[PDB]
Nucleic acid binder design. Structure first.
Ligand SMILES: [Mn+2]
Ligand SMILES: [Mn+2]
Lengths: 243, 251, 590, 243
DNA sequence: CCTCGTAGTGCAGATGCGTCGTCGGACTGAT
DNA sequence: ATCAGTCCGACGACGCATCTGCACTACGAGG
């Protein structure tokens, strides 16, 4: 089970939505791709990553791979490479996986598979009312801005605007209506009115920036979902319980 | 009911930060001659005055002189993020409160600002009419350098000016700080009239200075023999700031 | 295999408090259950996850974090549960009403599969063990998450004790010492072997290992017991008495007195070449005291001994001891070697219970009090407390004048006789740990006006047994809080306080009273009460004499105690800020 | 006396690297060198740094050997105020150490000469089996990322190569410094073993942007001899007691 | 060199633990 | 009916962790 990945930024940022959301996940290198869906203990949020065989220098598999990890430990052992350094992940025995960081010093580590168990997640199969598209850097800035003093944010958009409003002290709102710079896409079924809280719902910060095209999936009496698309067919889908 | 646009949002953020370092609730006195504000400390040692001459505004239309009292308990942070140096900010009164808007031509991320406040009786524009002998211009990394240097080795800083020379001596006998400003050092222009010395509040010196980062233009600094210091600098898109600190004549 | 027991069977252990059935019910816990689970359920009845000498992190979920966690669990905001618990007061009996709206789907249960189940003891213990150790940058949202998730998977009766388990001591009516008789009356008959169980428990501080040892073996396993180095022995204690002479008529000829100091009494250890510095509460403090390990292994010419002593802080100029508050500076873990140069220390040793690999727990106080005199030699460092044999009755007070200068005040009385040995486990009439007359506070009588009230905490916290007092200021015609009073009222006074406040209850604060503290309710200033205190202390919470003495701070009365009501004095006749300041000025500076 | 260095951020960095091991130190001036030594209160780590006669710009001597003993916190934190590229001159006649900057802003600091010291010069002549040569820019890049995966390391050599291995908890890190890999300059062959902690080897990485090369003399059951090669013929030894 | 994006550190603010004991009030139970 | 021992527990001030969030700055890289 030898795999080689050219980039480390993909392996230094994708886990930011995973580092503090659920402390346990199942890195599932498939027989034909790599796909990651793992539940969360809060039973509120859930992230997924889709990655086919397009960004791996070498990818040889024979059986299912379930390298366990600790989120904090995984981040720690992926903080050495800075510029472009590649990685070399393989082993021979299912007791420890040799994680070799290509470049500079010949460096490989031995990490125990802290095996954990979790339930399966269905393939959404749910439709929503709005799938908008804004500036990801701008939308991240809005999530960081409208929720800086408050502890709750209300999402409301009637026909041609999106307002993730947070009230209680001052009704400060940011809109992306028509083609004024925001709302690059919009599907409509009904007027929108919902809320999404602060704190660890603000802790999806450094994940969107990989692709500068956000796509929410907010809907009435429905959980949240952030839709994305990267190069090489890499899409990451977010989940979030109401308010 | 007025509509005045400030083409620089970061300038507005800098102004509100500069006025925040003296109190918690501020004012924005709207007159037919400009937009100006005024405040002072409880101990009368330091204060900031912000005014906007009516020549640099993109639009400027007000019927009557109006003044409003507002707090920056939340306004500071909700305006603490404006990621566009090219962002224009406009303010317009509403029926009950205060409404401010910011526009950026990068993502269409217009942000609406609401402040719960009403107009009040205005106060006549009155500035301490004094003349300062020593006058000079400098960058934004000389005042901050002096503040940060002194912030450790004492709280009593004395700025001594010689004939075309500037001397700093501060702290107590155990630990001091020695530096000089020779003609054309970290200044630019000099208008020294009389060699004089004075003193101020070093912690409040840094407190006044720290609300000044972002001023891309040189800062004009003046004081006198026990005269309240002037720290003058205007931003790129208009707006003149005048900072007052009172000389603590012995303790 | 179920934790539901610690809810169902444990619901009755607080309404039948009699010490006749609670012990009987405590027997049923160990009557007939699993093998290894019992060793794990044992830690419930001490308010711990495990004995604190093995070395483990302390659970970081306190109260406000628990407030946020329960808010997450019940899908409510921060302030709702805050006020609902402040009004009730007794935090922990809030979750029953919190989980009154049993409706929380979220995700993972609404799309394709719906399920719900319970947990067991080995699950809760494992989750607690994992949540203790997890730390780092991803801490706040991860520690809260497990408590919230378990609470979301809890039960209404479970959410009556699961909150308090995180809070701390189990409010049950049962302590650790009762577990000692529980197994005694469960496995080995009754109280006959209770002494043997206690004897086995004394020398080793654990509660899981000892319990497992007893479970795997028989009752006779309580026989072959010796103090093994490392795991210490529970220290013994006594009470404070005011009787000048009640010991001579029961003991020998005035025996000896060896003073009594403070300073976090600690049990030194030594095995092979290793040494441990266990303290009163059975916690590893060896690392935090690296200056004493070199005092013992290099100046106590022993091989393997376990002793008892006190580690009192020492003044940096001379030897006159110090308050334990100053000693608290030696709890650092990072800048440890720096604090050593500032605060010197000197240990004293009282007890000596193990040497030559032979037990010494049950021996007279002659080969114990004075045993290794050729080993613990005099030096400029750790010594043994000064003791002199008292000759006659009048000599019980002559050394008081010399020993009070040290600052420990009271002394102890060593009782000779076979009936008086160092058998530990029970705090009682073993050897008099007197305090002479100790040192009390001061007394000052003032009249204060009631302006607010606070609901108390605990089983009797439902009523408003706490009040905020304010003083009238003639200069500003305003009332400023001077102290917060919570004790000093009799049962009838406490009962009448609620009705008296309700008769004058108001929703909003009176404009003539100002205070930085927020009471549960606002009360019209009508009645005036007399409160006695010790001294005036500066406290930023109170606005009395604000900025007069210290900036951003005010004067406050230390140790508030209620005395009587003043029905004939108007609030305007209460103590004034000027009088408070004048009284503060007359107090000594030191 | 008059002292001056060409890099206000360099000498202050070498001295700042002594602000984590030594809680105190004393200064003396020889005929052609300045001694930065002293036994730590920790009774484990031995520090003795020799300033070469060529690091200055006009060093002078007035009468004879003089002690310039200092207090750690002051001459460490007041000299935290260094610009990007300045010059630091030191003047201390009899009682006052005047740390004076020059360049962009002619500034100065003041401090009385505090008299307290621990002058124990133990003999260092024990031989070692192993020898290696590594540049100053790779050792730090390895150890800093190795400074978080525990607190104890282990060093073992075989077939003339240095293996940096970190053990602890349940997962281990491996580093394979070798001449053939190019992450070396010169070395020797000796198969020995030892063990060392991290805080005693991770606190000393701060002297990275002050040196040119590095000499490590690893050994068996003997003090670790890390030597920091200095510009213009200096001594950078960092003795470490074994486990 | 200009500019931006991210790493990196320094620093206040908020929660929690350890710490001395101190006093309480109720339960058993033998005269 | 009356005091002995016996026992769980509640108490509320202090100094230090430990993390979280922010504010400011240093450096690497494409143009
Ligand atoms: Mn607790
Ligand atoms: Mn504890």
């Amino acid at each position: 089970m030898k795999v080689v990945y050219d980039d480390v930024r993909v392996l230094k940022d994708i886990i930011q939505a995973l580092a503090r959301l659920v402390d346990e996940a199942v890195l599932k290198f498939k027989q034909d791709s790599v796909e990651l869906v793992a539940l969360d203990r809060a039973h509120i949020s859930l992230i997924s990553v889709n990655l086919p065989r397009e960004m791996f220098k070498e990818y040889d598999v024979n059986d299912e791979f379930k390298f366990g990890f600790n989120t904090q430990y995984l981040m720690k052992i992926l903080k050495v490479a800075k510029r472009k350094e590649a990685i070399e992940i393989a082993s021979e025995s299912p007791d420890s996986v040799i994680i070799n960081i290509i470049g500079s010093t010949n460096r490989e580590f031995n990490v125990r598979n802290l095996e954990v168990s979790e339930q399966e997640i269905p393939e959404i199969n749910l439709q929503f009312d709005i799938s908008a598209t804004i500036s990801s850097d701008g939308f991240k800035s809005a999530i960081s801005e409208v929720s800086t003093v408050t502890d709750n944010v209300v999402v409301e958009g009637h026909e041609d605007r999106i307002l993730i409003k947070a009230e209680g002290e001052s009704e400060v709102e940011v809109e992306f209506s028509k083609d004024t710079g925001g709302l690059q896409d919009l599907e409509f079924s009904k007027e929108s009115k919902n809320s999404y809280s602060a704190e660890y719902l603000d802790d999806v910060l450094s994940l969107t920036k990989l692709s500068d095209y956000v796509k929410i999936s907010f809907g009435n009496q429905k959980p949240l979902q952030l839709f994305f698309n990267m190069e090489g067919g890499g899409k990451v889908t977010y989940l979030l319980a109401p308010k | 009911a007025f509509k005045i646009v400030y083409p620089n949002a970061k300038d507005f953020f800098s102004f509100i930060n500069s006025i925040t370092n003296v109190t918690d609730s501020i004012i924005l006195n709207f007159t037919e001659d400009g937009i100006f504000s005024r405040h002072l400390t409880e101990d009368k040692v330091l204060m900031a005055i912000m005014r906007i001459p009516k020549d640099v505004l993109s639009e400027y239309s007000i019927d009557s002189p109006t003044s409003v009292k507002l707090d920056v308990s939340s306004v500071k942070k909700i305006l603490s993020k404006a990621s566009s140096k090219k962002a224009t900010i406009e303010l317009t009164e509403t029926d009950s409160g205060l409404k401010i808007i910011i526009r950026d031509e990068k993502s269409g991320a217009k942000s609406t600002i609401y402040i719960k406040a009403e107009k009040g009786q205005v106060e006549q524009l009155t500035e301490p009419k004094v003349n300062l002998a020593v006058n000079f211009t400098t960058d934004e990394s000389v005042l901050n350098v002096i503040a940060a240097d002194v912030t450790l080795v004492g709280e009593e800083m004395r700025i001594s000016t010689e004939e075309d020379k500037i001397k700093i001596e501060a702290g107590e006998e155990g630990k001091r700080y020695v530096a000089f400003l020779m003609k054309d050092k970290p200044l630019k222009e000099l208008s020294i009239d009389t060699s004089a010395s004075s003193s101020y509040s070093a912690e409040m010196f840094k407190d006044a200075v720290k609300g000044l980062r972002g001023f891309s233009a040189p800062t004009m600094v003046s004081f006198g023999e026990n005269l309240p210091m002037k720290i003058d600098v205007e931003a790129v898109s208009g707006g003149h700031m005048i900072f007052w600190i009172a000389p603590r004549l012995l303790e | 295999m179920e934790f539901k027991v610690i809810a169902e069977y444990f619901d009755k252990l607080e309404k039948i408090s009699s010490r006749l059935q609670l012990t009987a019910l405590l027997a049923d816990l160990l009557s007939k259950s699993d093998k290894t689970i019992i060793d794990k359920v044992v830690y419930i009845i001490q308010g711990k996850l495990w004995p604190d000498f093995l070395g483990y992190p302390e659970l970081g979920i306190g109260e406000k974090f628990l407030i946020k966690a329960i808010s997450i669990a019940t899908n409510t905001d921060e302030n709702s549960v805050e006020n609902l618990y402040k009004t009730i007061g007794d935090l922990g009996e809030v979750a029953r009403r919190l989980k009154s709206k049993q409706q929380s789907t979220g995700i993972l249960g609404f799309l394709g599969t719906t399920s719900k189940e319970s947990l067991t003891v080995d699950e809760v213990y494992s989750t607690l063990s994992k949540v203790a150790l997890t730390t780092g940058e991803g801490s706040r949202d991860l520690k809260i998450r497990l408590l919230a998730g378990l609470l979301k998977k809890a039960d209404p009766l479970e959410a009556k004790f699961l909150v308090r388990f995180v809070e701390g001591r189990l409010r049950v009516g049962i302590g650790d010492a009762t577990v000692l008789d529980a197994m005694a009356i469960a496995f080995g008959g009754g109280q006959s072997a209770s002494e043997i169980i206690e004897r086995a428990y004394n020398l080793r501080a654990d509660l899981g290992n000892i319990a497992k040892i007893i479970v795997e073996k028989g009752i006779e396993a309580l026989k072959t017991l010796k103090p093994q180095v490392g795991i210490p022995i529970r220290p013994m204690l006594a009470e404070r008495l005011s009787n000048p002479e009640e010991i001579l008529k029961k003991m020998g000829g005035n025996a000896i007195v060896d003073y009594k100091y403070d300073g976090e009494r600690a049990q030194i250890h030594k095995k092979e070449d290793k040494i441990f510095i266990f303290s009163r509460r059975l916690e590893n403090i060896t690392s935090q005291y690296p200056d004493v390990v070199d005092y013992v292994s290099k100046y106590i010419e022993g091989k393997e001994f376990i002793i008892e002593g006190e580690i009192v802080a020492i003044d940096p100029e001379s030897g006159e001891m110090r308050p334990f508050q100053e000693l608290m500076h030696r709890k650092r873990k990072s800048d440890i070697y720096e604090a050593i140069k500032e605060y010197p220390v000197n240990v004293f040793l009282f007890d000596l219970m193990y040497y030559e690999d032979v037990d010494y727990t049950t021996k007279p106080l002659e080969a114990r009090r004075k045993l290794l005199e050729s080993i613990v030699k005099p030096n400029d460092y750790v010594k043994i407390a000064h003791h002199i044999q008292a000759n006659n009755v009048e000599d019980l007070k002559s050394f008081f004048y010399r020993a009070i200068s040290e600052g420990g005040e009271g002394v102890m009385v060593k009782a000779i006789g076979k009936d008086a040995i160092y058998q530990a486990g029970a705090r009682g009439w073993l050897w008099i740990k007197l305090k002479r007359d100790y040192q009390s506070e001061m007394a000052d009588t003032v009249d204060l006006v009631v302006v607010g009230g606070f609901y108390g905490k605990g089983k009797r916290g439902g009523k408003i047994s706490s009040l905020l007092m304010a003083a009238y200021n003639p200069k500003t015609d305003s009332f400023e809080s001077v102290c917060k009073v919570a004790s000093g009222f009799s049962d009838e006074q406490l009962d009448e306080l609620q009705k008296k406040l309700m008769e004058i209850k108001r929703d909003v604060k009176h404009p003539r009273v100002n205070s930085k503290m927020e009471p549960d309710i606002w009360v019209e200033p009508v009645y005036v009460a007399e409160i006695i205190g010790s001294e005036i202390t500066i406290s930023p919470l109170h606005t009395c004499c604000q900025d007069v003495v210290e900036k951003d701070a005010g004067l406050s009365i230390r140790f508030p105690r209620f005395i009587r009501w003043r029905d004939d004095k108007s609030p305007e006749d209460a103590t004034t800020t000027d009088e408070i300041l004048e009284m503060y000025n007359k107090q000594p500076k030191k | 006396m008059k002292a001056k260095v060409i890099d206000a951020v360099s000498f202050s960095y070498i001295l700042r690297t002594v602000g984590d091991f030594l809680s105190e130190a004393n200064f003396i001036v020889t005929k052609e060198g300045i001694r930065v030594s002293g036994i730590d209160p920790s009774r484990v780590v031995f520090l003795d740094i020799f300033l070469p006669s060529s690091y200055f710009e006009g060093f002078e001597v007035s009468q004879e050997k003089e002690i310039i003993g200092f207090k750690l916190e002051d001459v460490n934190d007041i000299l935290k105020r260094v610009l990007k590229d300045d010059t630091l001159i030191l003047s201390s006649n009899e009682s006052k150490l005047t740390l004076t900057f020059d360049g962009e802003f002619t500034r100065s600091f003041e401090l009385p000469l505090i008299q307290v010291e621990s002058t124990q010069p133990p003999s260092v002549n024990l031989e070692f089996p192993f020898k290696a040569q590594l540049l100053t820019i790779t050792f730090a890049d390895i150890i800093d990322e190795l400074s978080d995966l525990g607190e104890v390391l282990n060093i073992h050599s075989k077939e003339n190569k240095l293996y940096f291995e970190v053990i602890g908890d349940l997962s281990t890190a491996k580093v394979e410094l070798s001449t053939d890999n190019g992450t070396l300059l010169e070395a020797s062959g000796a198969d020995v073993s030892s063990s060392y902690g991290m805080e005693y080897v991770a606190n000393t990485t701060k002297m990275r942007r002050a040196s040119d090369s590095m000499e490590l003399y690893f050994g068996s059951q003997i003090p670790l001899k890390l030597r920091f090669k200095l510009p213009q013929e200096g001594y950078g030894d960092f003795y470490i007691a074994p486990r």
